[PDB]
Amino acid sequence: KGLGKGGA
Amino acid sequence: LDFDILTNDGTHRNMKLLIDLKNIFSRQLPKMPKEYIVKLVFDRHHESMVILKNKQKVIGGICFRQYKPQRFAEVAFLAVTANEQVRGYGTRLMNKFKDHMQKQNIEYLLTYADNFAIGYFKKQGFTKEHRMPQEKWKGYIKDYDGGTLMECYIHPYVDYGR
Ligand SMILES: CC(C)(COP(=O)(O)OP(=O)(O)OC[C@H]1O[C@@H](n2cnc3c(N)ncnc32)[C@H](O)[C@@H]1OP(=O)(O)O)[C@H](O)C(=O)NCCC(=O)NCCS
């Protein structure tokens, strides 16, 4: 679930 | 528009659907090693529910791993292809997932979140404060100090989606 901001 | 559990049964059909989903995951999760996504998606413990458009095209999905005896599952990856975002699919998927988890006798959903991500799961009903005894996931779900562990309680008779 690695997340670095963004993602609409 | 269907939300089906995609079985990794070694058939050309499912294999292709899983690969398409895996590619949506890497394109949408750039910080994630692609080979790591490959490993989890196709391993013996993980399962995937896909958003199927016209019973043939994958436009999203969620990869998860159930810990049946413990009655909780971990979300590995969640994503909707770029050209299909902001149309409510992602939220509908999560609701279908909760309903499926409830039917699977799963009591809690766990997932690691970072940055923006945290905000997304909070809107999906996940919280930073856990009500599930820590020693329950300890030893099953890796404990990373670098990520925020979030959980969502799945009440046995609350209606999630459908
Ligand atoms: C959602 C994906 C999960 C499919 O979803 P498709 O909040 O809700 O404004 P469905 O920016 O439209 O939405 C539920 C809502 O939360 C929004 N949002 C997304 N991440 C968010 C976050 N971290 N915090 C707050 N809002 C967020 C959704 O885009 C959507 O828009 P809205 O709030 O105006 O309705 C999406 O981009 C995607 O594939 N993102 C990249 C992959 C990713 O980060 N996956 C989860 C981590 S593995």
Give resolution in angstroms: 2.2
Element of type H or E holding B14: helix B12-28
Strand partners, B52: B2, B58
What is the strand order of the sheet B46-53 is part of? B2-6, B46-53, B57-67, B72-80, B108-113, B148-153
Ligand 1 atom closest to residue B89's alpha carbon, by position in its atom list? 6
Q: Do A2 and B29 touch (CB under 8 A)?
A: yes
B99 within 8 A of B160, measured Cβ to Cβ: yes
Buried-state track B132-154, b at ≥16 Cβ within 10 A, e below 16: eeeebbeeebeeeeebebbbbeb
CATH classification at residue B117:
3.40.630.30
Residues of A with Cβ-Cβ distance to B86 under 8 angstroms: 8
Residues of A with Cβ-Cβ distance to B91 under 8 angstroms: none
B55 within 8 A of B61, measured Cβ to Cβ: no
Q: A interface mutation test: which of B27, B32, B40, B152 has the most A CBs within 10 A?
A: B32
Element of type H or E holding B150: strand B148-153
Question: What SS3 class is residue B110?
Answer: strand
Residues of A with Cβ-Cβ distance to B78 under 8 angstroms: 1
Domain that holds residue B89: 1-162
Ligand 1 and B88: CB distance under 6 A:
yes
Nearest chain B residue (CA) to A7 = B28
In the annotated binding site of B, the residues are 78, 80, 85-88, 90-91, 116-117, 123
Nearest chain B residue (CA) to A2 = B32
What is the β-pairing status of strands B148-153 and B72-80? unpaired
Structural domain total, chain B: 1
The counts of H helices and E strands in chain B are 4, 6
B73 within 8 A of B62, measured Cβ to Cβ: no
Virtual CA dihedral for B32, B115, B117, B156, nearest 10 degrees?
110
Positive or negative, the Cα torsion across B77, B79, B25, B48? positive
Looking at residue B155, its amino acid is: H
Rounded to 5 degrees, φ, ψ at B104 are -85, 15
Rounded to 5 degrees, φ, ψ at B16 are -65, -45
Listed by number, the residues of chain B in 121-160 with a beta carbon closer than 8 Å to a beta carbon of chain A are none
Q: How many C-beta atoms lie closer than 10 Å to residue B99's C-beta?
A: 17
